[model samples]
Target: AGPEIVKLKKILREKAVPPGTEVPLDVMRKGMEKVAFKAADDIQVEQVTVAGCAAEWVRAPGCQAGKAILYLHGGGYVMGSINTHRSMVGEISRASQAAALLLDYRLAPEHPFPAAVEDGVAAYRWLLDQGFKPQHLSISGDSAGGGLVLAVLVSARDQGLPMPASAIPISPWADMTCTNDSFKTRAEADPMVAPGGINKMAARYLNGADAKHPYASPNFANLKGLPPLLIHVGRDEVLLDDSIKLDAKAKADGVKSTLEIWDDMIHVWHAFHPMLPEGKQAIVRVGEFMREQWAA
Candidate 1:
């Protein structure tokens, strides 16, 4: 949040693509998969299937029994995978002293609307079947996946499934409508996300479904009865207003909500903890929040 963000901003700016520029989905998916990032050696990873969807359990040292986090990766609902987010999930696992389950939920333009949500619910049900208490488990994600975190909870509630202990949506894209003022105000300030590209992704994910549907975009969802929430958004991201409004909706509905807007941080900076001190710092806060939820 301080001077540490400057260098990373410079790096992102140098590699930044112009907004609205199109890249083939396959290339983006492969390139993201091939990204070189440092991973912790002390963590153990086990490949497993949850409701038939590919997934893995990431555990850092000292993970507490019965505590776990269901991590949904962000690729605008079209791209990201377990590989892109595995290391960061491990970091959070260690920070929260809990195991993290990362899922390879179905993607869009193929799987489309409700498919990812279906996979999300299935993984959640798997956790419950594995004997994870609703009050001890939490869900988290970034960007599109961040939105999915809320959608899953809402879906779970509607299906008579108990809510998790809490949820953390980092830089969430909760509005497929793209009406957020920040989309225009923070367009140029954001280094990682593109306004037009995200809109396209939303369309791909939504398919012919209503954008305003509660399950598709939680900003428009009723937040009356759900678990506690700790939402994080970068101050400069175009999705800033989405989190702002979602916070309002949550509080208005009497949900316990915490929203953190980090100054100068780009979208999902927590994944960049190896370079940004504040990244790890925000993650530690997430761990603290989860611990309080589980204890409650």
Candidate 2:
């Protein structure tokens, strides 16, 4: 479905500089804020709430959208916030023709694992409490947030909460252990993710706990009885193996899962906004998928 993106990846590879060797939390956070601001400007949304660390909501223009999508912003689960994801939600609202609630879930190196995942579950639970039907709710996130979407779903299954009708985890970091071969094979090839950065973040969040814990590494989570899933990733992303393995496990466990591999783009490259055709086309595909799921 996304053949040209492969070419885009090759071109971007030649242009991308080597990732940072030593990470500074403040520097990364600043970069996130700058990039997120650019993206939000393109989506035309500015509302905010504190449901989960300042979530932002957007509805389709003039439609009074019925369904809802819970958005989790990407920043390795450490830096993104409502402002970071505000624009992406706007695009989601416009594309899916549904309202989007962006969850600025708690970050890591402080709040850590389960903290962000808990906020996500609480927000989804709040939606259900307010009378949103399972069919009317879809959960989504990118990178760590993307991985959390899966955690939230499985946790919901275990808790007996009605699951969201669908979930889209973009370039999800399904394996916290970073044991996948792609981590090495795609390291230099993937521009968006920094090797060891994820491990450092995951370790800080894990706080001496096991990285392979299912809640942290959802690929280890039992996939039985979860809702339908839609995952997107660049084929060369460091985290691509996470999505690939998770999808295979879900399908093997009798769960419905679809993985869309785009070419050449970096991790959650769709979050780049109008600068990339890959981003625009992705939102369109998302909108169509949301409609089909709602109808089904």
Candidate 3:
């Protein structure tokens, strides 16, 4: 691990809750919203609405005029907003040399299941209507948003919409049942997530819907004919098995997929760039993977 990774581990350890901390949903939302973010001075941000959903466009200097990325924020389907993820999206725009659109999708316990999927597909269609060819676009997200990325793609495919150039799902929560073994095996090592808290969020998000519904838990969906995918997950996160199983299923279904397991990192560590060298490195890798897909 790099020195930055070491420092990040220390910081996470310091901020970690005791084994029995009672973190309610509201507290989790507030805590995520309060996370400190790094600013990118050279990146320009523009606010807009995509099919009624609020969104922000992050564009760095010399970004490709016709190419772009659609970024989704992670918060277990009940939290997160563009505001919480803008800086990281800015960094992505810089690395990819493409503009990035971060969507503020409707969250659960209010909008519930299928609302997010509806909004995501609506945003993609809105982008198409605005003249971005599917081949010029890439989709990406982290955590629940990562699962949303796949759900949107699967929904699009079934709807007959053209596939985007590429996709990146970082530490995706692909399985809604939260039954993946890593949830037990890595429970102690994963600093940010706990089984009980995640289970509650999943229940709230599902809202009595089938947990394995293709649009709900995409890991259970057919992956054939989807766009090429690059999946990133940290070795230490409880969601590690989610990515592993999804990758295996995608390959079994003949989808072109690449999986990278970073050593000793936590969930969505890319959000900690500059403070963690691996974070920047992962973003660069995403850029490289997307560029390859665009070239193909």
Candidate 4:
């Protein structure tokens, strides 16, 4: 692990919630926004609506005109908003030289089981309607949003829409059932996510829907015909096996897939750029992968 990552893990250990304690949803949301980096001055944001879903267009200086990224924020399908992930999205936009659309999909308990997935597909279709060809677009997200990116691609293919040029999913929560071995093996190593806490969020989002449903859990989906995928995950995360299994599955189904496992990293470590050098390094690698796909 990098020195900064080690320091971050130490801070996390110190600030972690007590075991068996549950935090209120609102409190968690506020805390996430407070800790996340603020959008940079050079990054411009514009509010917009996509098929009735509220969204923000985050654009960095020198961003490409025609190329775009559709990014979904992670909150386990319940807590995140555009403001909470603006800086992360800004980093990606600046690194990839692509404008990003950050969607505020409806949350669960109030809007559960396919609501987020439906909105994700709607946002993609909305982008298509805006005159950007599928060949020039990329879909991406972190954590739950990462899983949602695959779901959106599957939905688009089933709906007969053209596939995007590529996708990037960071530490994706791909298996809603929490059946992966990492959930148990990395339970003590991962400082960010706990199995019990994630189970509850999964239940809330599933809302009695089949946990293995393709849209709910892309890990169970048919990967054939999907666009090229680049998956990044932290080896220390409980969701590590999620990316590993998904990559294996995608390749088995004849899809182009790349998987990168960062040793001793935690969930969505890419969100901590500037503070953790590895985070910025991961984003640069992501940009390189996306640029390569665009060139092809």
Best-matching candidate per lDDT: 4
TM-score leaderboard ranking:
4, 1, 3, 2
Off by over 4 Å in 1: none
The TM-score obtained by model 3 is 0.97
lDDT of each: 0.90, 0.78, 0.89, 0.91
**What clash pairs does model 4 have?**
none
Query: Per-residue lDDT for 1-296 in model 4, tens only?
Result: 67899999999989999876998878887988788788888999999988788899999887989999999999898888999899888989988889999999988879997999899999999999999999999999999999999999998899998999999999998889998888889888899997678988999899999999999899999989998999999999999999999999999999999999999899999888868999988988888888899999
- Candidate 3, residue 28: how far the Cα is off, in Å: 2.4
Model 1 global lDDT (CA atoms, 0 to 1): 0.90
Give the per-residue lDDT of model 2 (tens digit) for 1-296: 35556566666666644565675888878876875544444344545654546766765563345588988877776788777777666787787878888877788888877888788888888888878788898988888888888888888788888887788888898888888999888887676677677778877778887788888889999988888888888876888789889999999988889889887668877776556788888877777777778889
Task: Compute each candidate's TM-score over C-alphas.
Answer: 0.97, 0.90, 0.97, 0.98
Q: In model 4, where is the ten-residue run with the lowest total lDDT?
A: 19-28
Q: How far off is residue 165 in model 1, in Å?
A: 1.0
1-296: candidate 3 lDDT, tens digit per residue? 67777777778889877666678878878887888485588879899998788898889777999898988889999999887888888888888889998999999999999999999898888889989999999999999999999999999999999999999998899889988889888877788787677888899999999999999999999888998999999998999999999999999999999999999889999998867788999988888898888989
Give the lDDT of residue 134 in candidate 3.
Answer: 95
Report backbone clashes per prediction.
0, 4, 0, 0
Candidate 4 accuracy as lDDT: 0.91
Question: By TM-score, who's the top model here?
Answer: 4
